[PDB]
Amino acid sequence: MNIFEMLRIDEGLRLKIYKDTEGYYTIGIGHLLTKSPSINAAKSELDKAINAAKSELDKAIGANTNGVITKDEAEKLFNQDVDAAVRGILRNAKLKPVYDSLDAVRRAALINMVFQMGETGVAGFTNSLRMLQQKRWDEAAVNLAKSRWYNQTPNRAKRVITTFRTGTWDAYKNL
Ligand SMILES: [Cl-]
C-alpha cells in the first residue's frame, strides 16, 4: 500500500465528467475541474457550466476531449495531482512541520487530505495539526471527526482518521 493505491481506493476511477458531493465537476481519479450551478440554476446556466468544465479538462489534457478521457490520461492527471499535493504541503508553513514530524504511513494520510481539500483547507485545521505534531493520535482522531469533512464523506474520513490513529494501513486492507 502506498499513497497512489490509497487515493485510487478513495477517489475511484471515472472516465467521464461527473459531479461530486461538494458540487464540483470531477473526472479520472479525483481530478477536480470547476463548480456546478444550483440544481435549479437555469437550463442556460447548466450548459454554460458543463462547457466550462469541458474547457478546463481540454486545457488539462491538451486535447479536445468533450468530457471523456482514457485510463492513461486519468493516471497522468493523478500523477500531477499527487505531485501537487506534496508540493503544496512542502511549501506551506503550517503543513510542512507536521508532515516532517510524521512517519511514512501518516504522511500518506496527510497527503490524502490535501489532495481532497487542498493546501489552504487542511492548513486551517490548526487544532488537529497540533495534536498530530504532538503524536496525540487518539485526540487527533476525535478532533478530525468534528468537521464538515467527516460529516460529508464519513467512510473516507474514517479510513484516513484510522490511518492517523494507528500508523498502519489496516483501514485499506481488503479494499
Ligand atoms: Cl491521544
UniProtKB/Swiss-Prot annotation:
Transmembrane segments: none annotated. The gene is E. Induction: Expressed late in the viral replication. GO terms for cellular component: host cell cytoplasm. This is Endolysin. Changing residue 30 to A: Almost complete loss of enzymatic activity. One of its GO terms (molecular function) is lysozyme activity. Changing residue 11 to A/F/H/M/N: Complete loss of enzymatic activity. Endolysin with lysozyme activity that degrades host peptidoglycans and participates with the holin and spanin proteins in the sequential events which lead to the programmed host cell lysis releasing the mature viral particles. Once the holin has permeabilized the host cell membrane, the endolysin can reach the periplasm and break down the peptidoglycan layer. Keywords: Antimicrobial, Bacteriolytic enzyme, Cytolysis, Glycosidase, Host cell lysis by virus, Host cytoplasm, Hydrolase, Viral release from host cell. Changing residue 20 to E/Q: Loss of 99% of enzymatic activity. It is an enzyme of class 3 (hydrolase). The active site is at residues 11, 20. Substrate binds at residues 32, 115, 128, 143. One of its GO terms (biological process) is cell wall macromolecule catabolic process. Changing residue 20 to A/N/S/T: Complete loss of enzymatic activity. PANTHER family: T4-TYPE LYSOZYME 1-RELATED. InterPro entries: Endolysin_T4_type (IPR034690), Glyco_hydro_24 (IPR002196), Lysozyme-like_dom_sf (IPR023346), Lysozyme_dom_sf (IPR023347), Phage_lysozyme-like (IPR052619), T4-type_lysozyme (IPR001165). Changing residue 143 to M/F: 2-fold decrease in enzymatic activity.
